[PDB]
RNA sequence: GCAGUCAAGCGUUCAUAGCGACAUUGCUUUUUGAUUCUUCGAUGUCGGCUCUUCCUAUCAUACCGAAGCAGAAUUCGGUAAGCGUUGGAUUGUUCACCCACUAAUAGGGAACGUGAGCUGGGUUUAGACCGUCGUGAGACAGGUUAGUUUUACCCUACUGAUGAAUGUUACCGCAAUAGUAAUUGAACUUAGUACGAGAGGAACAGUUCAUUCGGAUAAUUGGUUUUUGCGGCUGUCUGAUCA
């Protein structure tokens, strides 16, 4: 089993859900719903749509998980 | 080189209509024609 | 004169008349072939339709292109608690048919069924089976007569059972009583099996195992009055037609001077009895279990219940039969499941299925999340919540 | 022995198989009449692997490879890729390629020492063709055709090519490839020679419709 | 899915009636292909026979080189705009309708095919998958 | 129009496998004549679209018999109307003729089925043009252009839907009678085997898909939007911000 991600926004797509679009230049796009798919036909930029993952990653929206510290070090010596 | 192709296309069996009393041959339009066999029905 | 261009007729003529069926609960017109070599069992079962969801599984059909591949599939979920057994019914055979000789009821009965014997419960003095339960007061002269009666005579033997509607998310409190045939050995052992099971429970896993082909018997979704176009699937007349185009133009020829039964007319659509055969069971899930929708490959502790409930139903806190395809009748509705009538060798009805995954997202509009735990993890902390 | 065979009823074997030195691949949905050609003469020399690539039965046109490496597209699943991890010997190097130009078997056209590829292939992908296989890559086109792989069978000893090709283009390839090339046809005059047949040192399998004048030119130049 | 076709095709949705003009994917002179008939169609009063991805259709060349024009000839459909479900799960659709010109045995007349090709067209016809660049 | 009977000539030898002339005996009312019984206080006068049903004189589909049937491909005949018989270019057309798919593109009937079911291209009022005819008014079943298609609410039939009266009321069944449905094709395998001097070239059993038809259903995909649910935009009105 496999779970692919949405091309426009960034959400995960469970099996048998949303469309797929093979463009004329041999490129593959997956959509979760017709909202993300209609914004693709209307020629919209996903960096400027507030609800997308491409917006919230670029604008530092909800970055408390990423920006917080974490342990990562070692020293064997031999 | 030769003996390769089929060059068929046209069907091997076909139909003609005939007036039995008068002795005339039908055409696809309204023509009835006058040909007592030989060279005309070949054409 | 002749028809010009031949074309096959619109509609099937052995589904007539299309008239509103006689009750929501459909009759089982035919039980399977009795074999007295094998032991006593139940041939059918009662449940309530909950809804549909999606499955993934690995196909195992040698010769196909899709061999050792994954496939999505649609499934229905029929909610199915235990049934309670309260009586027996013995049928003697005559030159005119099967005739019911005697019925015998249990000492005690639940309110759930008493209900079914009234139209105005709340005003009732509730006197049903008050005089019958007094038969059981003495040692058993009048009761054991009527089972010796069924042993002596009687060719077939049905058992009278009812649902526990209360263990279920519906409004009504009045249960569905029914007959169910026994296909065991010796009319004596069938009635002695009934004798024992008066006011006893029967679950679904005893009747139905997994991979079993079953038939579904129900009343179909209703639509009231309907025109000839959608009812019978007939052609629309063109745009220029004065006074109506969702019609049949010629209702009939001059002779016979009478409109025929065979032609299509406007009228009732839906709410018909329908038996639908050869549906494969994919899961007999348990009620008391918090890994109901869990699988071998999935490993998440979850029920089959989707996010925010099944729409217009509820939760499923009970046993159920997850059966492939679709099934006649709408959600909430009483359904009869029945064992197959013949031994289906086929090739297909034999293929043992093992599920990969069951979709448990919201059915109330384009759900993105399987669990509420997976919803909080993806988004993280918000203004409310943690 | 130039063994004649079909797949179900197809003469195009190079669609359904990929024959090299160290290994051999075949499509799944076939009869025992298909495998008698492959299994009999080899016997117990090299591993014959039953498989499918990207859920298709056209592995020859999807794959491309020699003795050291087998290239595949991204569609190959973990079930399909892990089956090749176990089946093949320790010396070979399998790898997924990321490129949106084609299926690899029409593009790539190669053996041990030298390789021929599609002229429009990018620089990011072409290093992985050199690194994994261990072959110096050069971009060429057979007599105008960009799809080299379907109109040119190749090997260490020699190579069969497209029928309508000039004298200069064949002799120019002999400088780079270091072998004697012969332009011919297969399967009763099919110009599609690359997909019609397969070839290696030990064997050269082809379709059942190949005639005796045509089967003489195959087995001579490849040197069996 | 029959005329020298290597395999049995699973049903996929129809989006190319009689009277459609799909594009010419191959490189043998023709520009676009006016479908006139679909090989292996049924019959029903008033229903137009319609092709799909992987079907062999009879066609004329309406726009192209003058040798291919004014003759009915066969042809195979390699792309589709009407979306179809696959058994694996997804609904997918290419950007346009397009096909290649081919003889009644199922062999290619062209040498190369521009753009992508369906996987369901490729399995079915070996000589289409021979000349393909991309597959899906 | 359709069917026997006799069999001329054919079919390299050979009347009767099969083509089959002329005679002689019939059936049909899907042709056209012949007649004038019914209707002139009016039975809507072409074709097409739509839709049911019936006939067999069976094009296909099932099982058979014959062959001047090696195989393949055909031809002739028997039971059988269970089940199907198409998409288009030109013409108002019926009819005709072509292109294409197909398992097959069989023939007919039901007031020459069907206009309070449609359409109105055609015919057949009045306007108008040409040609020939006529001194002229005018004729032409010759060509051409434009020309009102009314009414159901009654009884019956068909479709669905209620319902008094068999001590009351409720629950669970029986089944007389009536209806009834599934249909055809590809591929792989059998096999380049059977058969044949070669060229060519099968079938039963199995596996897999599909065509036409039917009954459901709405996980998903798509369609629909007065959820006037959320968001935007124009002009104007509430002094401006909001609303
Ligand atoms: Mg009108
Ligand atoms: Mg929903
Ligand atoms: Mg029509
Ligand atoms: Mg008179
Ligand atoms: Mg009168
Ligand atoms: Mg009248
Ligand atoms: Mg008969
Ligand atoms: Mg028309
Ligand atoms: Mg009439
Ligand atoms: Mg009438
Ligand atoms: Mg009228
Ligand atoms: Mg006039
Ligand atoms: Mg004059
Ligand atoms: Mg008019």
Swiss-Prot record, chain A:
- Superkingdom as given in the UniProt entry: Eukaryota
An example Gene Ontology molecular-function term: mRNA binding
Cellular component per GO, a single term: cytosol
Q: Does the keyword field hold Cytoplasm?
A: yes
Q: Which residues carry this modification: Phosphoserine?
A: 7
The protein's predominant localisation is: cytoplasm
The answer to keyword Repeat applying to this record is no
Q: How does it assemble?
A: Component of the large ribosomal subunit (LSU). Mature yeast ribosomes consist of a small (40S) and a large (60S) subunit. The 40S small subunit contains 1 molecule of ribosomal RNA (18S rRNA) and 33 different proteins (encoded by 57 genes). The large 60S subunit contains 3 rRNA molecules (25S, 5.8S and 5S rRNA) and 46 different proteins (encoded by 81 genes).
Q: What does this protein do?
A: Component of the ribosome, a large ribonucleoprotein complex responsible for the synthesis of proteins in the cell. The small ribosomal subunit (SSU) binds messenger RNAs (mRNAs) and translates the encoded message by selecting cognate aminoacyl-transfer RNA (tRNA) molecules. The large subunit (LSU) contains the ribosomal catalytic site termed the peptidyl transferase center (PTC), which catalyzes the formation of peptide bonds, thereby polymerizing the amino acids delivered by tRNAs into a polypeptide chain.
> This chain belongs to which protein, by name?
Large ribosomal subunit protein eL24A
The organism of origin for this protein: Saccharomyces cerevisiae (strain ATCC 204508 / S288c) (Baker's yeast)
**Which stretch of the full-length chain is present here?**
1 to 78 of 155
Curated annotation (Swiss-Prot), chain C:
Modifications made to the protein after synthesis: Methylation at His-242 by HPM1 is required for proper 60S subunit assembly and promotes translational elongation fidelity.
Q: Where is this cross-link: Glycyl lysine isopeptide (Lys-Gly) (interchain with G-Cter in ubiquitin)?
A: 38, 135
Phosphoserine is carried by which residues?
23, 155, 296
Keywords of this entry: Cytoplasm, Isopeptide bond, Methylation, Phosphoprotein, Ribonucleoprotein, Ribosomal protein, Ubl conjugation
Q: Can you supply a Gene Ontology BP term from the record?
A: cytoplasmic translation
Sites bearing Phosphothreonine, chain numbering: 102
* Quaternary structure and interacting proteins, as annotated: Component of the large ribosomal subunit (LSU). Mature yeast ribosomes consist of a small (40S) and a large (60S) subunit. The 40S small subunit contains 1 molecule of ribosomal RNA (18S rRNA) and 33 different proteins (encoded by 57 genes). The large 60S subunit contains 3 rRNA molecules (25S, 5.8S and 5S rRNA) and 46 different proteins (encoded by 81 genes). uL3 forms together with ES39L one of the contact sites for the signal recognition particle that targets ribosomes to the endoplasmic reticulum membrane.
| Protein family | Belongs to the universal ribosomal protein uL3 family.
What this protein is called in its record is Large ribosomal subunit protein uL3
Taxonomy, top ranks, is: Eukaryota, Fungi, Dikarya, Ascomycota, Saccharomycotina
From Swiss-Prot, chain D:
PTM summary: Phosphorylation at Ser-174 and Ser-175 promotes nuclear export.
Q: Where in the cell is it found?
A: Cytoplasm; Nucleus, Nucleolus
Q: Which GO terms describe its biological process?
A: assembly of large subunit precursor of preribosome; cytosolic ribosome assembly; maturation of 5.8S rRNA; maturation of 5.8S rRNA from tricistronic rRNA transcript (SSU-rRNA, 5.8S rRNA, LSU-rRNA); maturation of LSU-rRNA; maturation of LSU-rRNA from tricistronic rRNA transcript (SSU-rRNA, 5.8S rRNA, LSU-rRNA); ribosomal large subunit biogenesis; ribosomal subunit export from nucleus
Q: What is its main location?
A: cytoplasm
Q: Which domain of life is it from?
A: Eukaryota
Q: Which residues carry this modification: Phosphoserine?
A: 174-175
State the coiled-coil residue ranges.
none
Q: Name one Pfam family in it.
A: eIF-6
Per UniProt, the keywords (alphabetical) are: Cytoplasm, Initiation factor, Nucleus, Phosphoprotein, Protein biosynthesis, Ribosome biogenesis
A single Gene Ontology CC annotation of this entry is: nucleus
Q: Does the keyword Cytoplasm apply?
A: yes
The molecular function GO annotations come to:
ribosomal large subunit binding; translation initiation factor activity
Per the entry, what this protein does is:
Binds to the 60S ribosomal subunit and prevents its association with the 40S ribosomal subunit to form the 80S initiation complex in the cytoplasm. Is also involved in ribosome biogenesis. Associates with pre-60S subunits in the nucleus and is involved in its nuclear export. Cytoplasmic release of TIF6 from 60S subunits and nuclear relocalization is promoted by the GTPase RIA1/EFL1 and by SDO1. Also required for pre-rRNA processing.
Which family is annotated? Answer: Belongs to the eIF-6 family.
**How would you summarize the oligomeric state and partners of this protein?**
Monomer. Associates with the 60S ribosomal subunit.
PANTHER family reported for this sequence: TRANSLATION INITIATION FACTOR 6
Gene encoding the protein: TIF6
Curated annotation (Swiss-Prot), chain E:
Keyword Acetylation in the entry? The reply is yes
Which Pfam families does the record match to this protein?
Ribosomal_L14
Gene Ontology MF terms: large ribosomal subunit rRNA binding; structural constituent of ribosome
Query: What other note does the entry give for this protein?
Result: There are 2 genes for uL14 in yeast.
**Which top-rank group of organisms is this from?**
Eukaryota
Query: Which named protein is this?
Result: Large ribosomal subunit protein uL14A
Positions where N-acetylserine occurs in the chain: 1
**The encoding gene:** RPL23A
Q: Which UniProt keywords apply?
A: Acetylation, Cytoplasm, Methylation, Ribonucleoprotein, Ribosomal protein
Posttranslational modification: Methylated by RKM1 at 2 different sites, but it is unclear which are the 2 methylated residues among Lys-39, Lys-105 and/or Lys-109.
What family is reported? Belongs to the universal ribosomal protein uL14 family.
Show the InterPro entries listed in the entry: Ribosomal_uL14 (IPR000218), Ribosomal_uL14_CS (IPR019972), Ribosomal_uL14_sf (IPR036853)
A cellular component term (GO) from this record?
Answer: cytosolic large ribosomal subunit
SMART domains for this protein: Ribosomal_L14
Sorted alphabetically, which PANTHER family does this protein's record hold? Answer: 50S/60S RIBOSOMAL PROTEIN L14/L23 (PTHR11761), LARGE RIBOSOMAL SUBUNIT PROTEIN UL14 (PTHR11761:SF8)
- Assembly, per entry: Component of the large ribosomal subunit (LSU). Mature yeast ribosomes consist of a small (40S) and a large (60S) subunit. The 40S small subunit contains 1 molecule of ribosomal RNA (18S rRNA) and 33 different proteins (encoded by 57 genes). The large 60S subunit contains 3 rRNA molecules (25S, 5.8S and 5S rRNA) and 46 different proteins (encoded by 81 genes).
GO process terms (BP):
cytoplasmic translation
> Which residues does the record list as N6,N6-dimethyllysine (modified residue)?
105, 109
- Cellular compartment(s): Cytoplasm
């Amino acid at each position: 089993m496999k779970v692919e991600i949405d091309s426009f926004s960034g959400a995960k797509i469970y099996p048998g859900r949303g469309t797929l679009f093979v463009r004329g230049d041999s490129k593959i796009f997956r959509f979760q719903n017709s909202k993300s798919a209609s914004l693709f036909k209307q020629r919209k930029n996903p960096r400027r749509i507030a609800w997308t993952v491409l917006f919230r990653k670029h604008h530092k929206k909800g970055i408390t998980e990423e920006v917080a510290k974490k342990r990562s070090r070692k020293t064997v010596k031999a | 080189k030769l003996t390769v192709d089929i060059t068929q296309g046209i069907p091997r069996e076909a139909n003609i209509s005939f007036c039995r009393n008068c002795e005339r041959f039908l055409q696809p339009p309204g023509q009835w024609i006058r040909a007592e066999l030989e060279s005309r029905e070949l054409l | 004169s002749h028809r010009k261009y031949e074309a096959p007729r619109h509609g099937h003529l052995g589904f007539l008349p299309r008239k509103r069926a006689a009750s929501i609960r459909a009759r089982v017109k035919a039980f399977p072939k009795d074999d007295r070599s094998k032991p006593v069992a139940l041939t059918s079962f009662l449940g309530y339709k909950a809804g549909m969801t999606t499955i993934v599984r690995d196909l195992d059909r040698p010769g196909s292109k899709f061999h050792k591949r994954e496939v999505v599939e649609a499934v229905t979920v029929v909610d199915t608690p235990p049934v309670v057994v309260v009586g027996v019914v013995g049928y003697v055979e005559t030159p005119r048919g099967l005739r019911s000789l005697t019925t015998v009821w249990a000492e005690h009965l639940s309110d759930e069924v008493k209900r079914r014997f009234y139209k105005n419960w709340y005003k009732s003095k509730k006197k049903a089976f008050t005089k019958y339960s007094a038969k059981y007061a003495q040692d058993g002269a009048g009761i054991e007569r009527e089972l010796a009666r069924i042993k002596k005579y009687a060719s077939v033997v049905r058992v009278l059972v009812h649902t526990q509607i209360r263990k279920t998310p519906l409004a009504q409190k009045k249960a569905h009583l029914a007959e169910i045939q026994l296909n065991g050995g010796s009319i004596s052992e069938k009635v002695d099996w009934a004798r024992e099971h008066f006011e006893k429970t029967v679950a679904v896993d005893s009747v139905f195992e997994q991979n079993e082909m079953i038939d579904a018997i129900a009343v179909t979704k209703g639509h009231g009055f309907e025109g000839v176009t959608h009812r019978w699937g007939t052609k629309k007349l063109p745009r220029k037609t004065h006074r109506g185009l969702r019609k049949v133009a010629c209702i009939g020829a001059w002779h016979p001077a009478h409109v025929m039964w065979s032609v299509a007319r406007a009228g009732q659509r839906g709410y018909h009895s329908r038996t639908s055969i050869n549906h494969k069971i994919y899961r007999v899930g348990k009620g008391d279990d918090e890994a109901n929708g869990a699988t071998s490959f999935d490993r998440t502790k979850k029920t089959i219940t989707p996010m925010g409930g099944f729409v217009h139903y509820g939760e499923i806190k009970n046993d159920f039969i997850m059966v492939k395809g679709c099934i006649p009748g709408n959600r909430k509705r009483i359904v009869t499941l029945r064992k197959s009538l013949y031994t289906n060798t086929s090739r297909k009805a034999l293929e043992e299925v093992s599920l990969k995954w069951i979709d448990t997202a919201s059915k109330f509009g384009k759900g993105r999340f399987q669990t509420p735990a997976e919803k909080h993890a993806f988004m993280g902390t918000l203004k409310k919540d943690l | 022995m130039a063994t004649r065979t079909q797949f179900e009823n197809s003469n195009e074997i190079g669609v359904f198989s990929k024959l090299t030195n160290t290994y051999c691949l075949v499509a799944v949905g076939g009869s025992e009449n298909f495998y008698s050609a492959f299994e009999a003469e080899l016997g117990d020399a090299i591993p014959i692997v039953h498989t499918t690539i990207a859920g298709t039965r056209i592995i020859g046109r999807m794959t491309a490879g020699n003795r050291r490496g087998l290239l595949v597209p991204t569609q190959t699943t973990d079930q399909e890729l892990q089956h090749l991890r176990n089946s093949l010997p320790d010396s070979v190097k399998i790898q997924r390629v990321e490129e949106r130009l084609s299926a690899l078997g029409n593009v790539i056209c190669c053996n041990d020492y030298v390789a021929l590829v599609h002229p429009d292939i990018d620089r990011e992908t072409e290093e992985l063709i050199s690194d994994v296989l261990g072959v110096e890559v050069f971009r060429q086109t057979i007599s105008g055709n960009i799809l080299v792989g379907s109109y040119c069978s190749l090997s260490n000893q020699g190579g069969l090519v497209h029928p309508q090709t000039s004298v200069q283009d064949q002799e120019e390839l002999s400088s780079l490839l270091q072998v004697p090339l012969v332009a011919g046809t297969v399967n009763r005059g099919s110009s599609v020679v690359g997909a019609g047949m397969v070839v290696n040192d030990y064997l050269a399998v082809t379709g059942l419709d190949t005639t005796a004048p045509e089967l003489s030119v195959i087995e001579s130049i490849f040197r069996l | 899915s029959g005329n020298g076709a290597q395999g049995t095709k699973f049903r996929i949705s129809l989006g190319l009636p009689v009277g459609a003009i799909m594009n010419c994917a191959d490189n043998s002179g023709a520009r676009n292909l006016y479908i006139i008939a679909v090989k292996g169609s049924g019959s029903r009063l008033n229903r137009l026979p319609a092709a799909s991805l992987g079907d062999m259709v009879m066609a004329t060349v309406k726009k192209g080189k003058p040798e291919l024009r004014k003759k009915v000839m066969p042809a195979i459909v390699v792309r589709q705009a009407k979306s179809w479900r696959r058994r694996d799960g997804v609904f997918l659709y290419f950007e346009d309708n397009a096909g290649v010109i081919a003889n009644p045995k199922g062999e290619m007349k062209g040498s190369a095919i521009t753009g992508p090709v369906g996987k369901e067209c490729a399995d079915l016809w070996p000589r289409v998958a021979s000349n393909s660049g991309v597959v899906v």
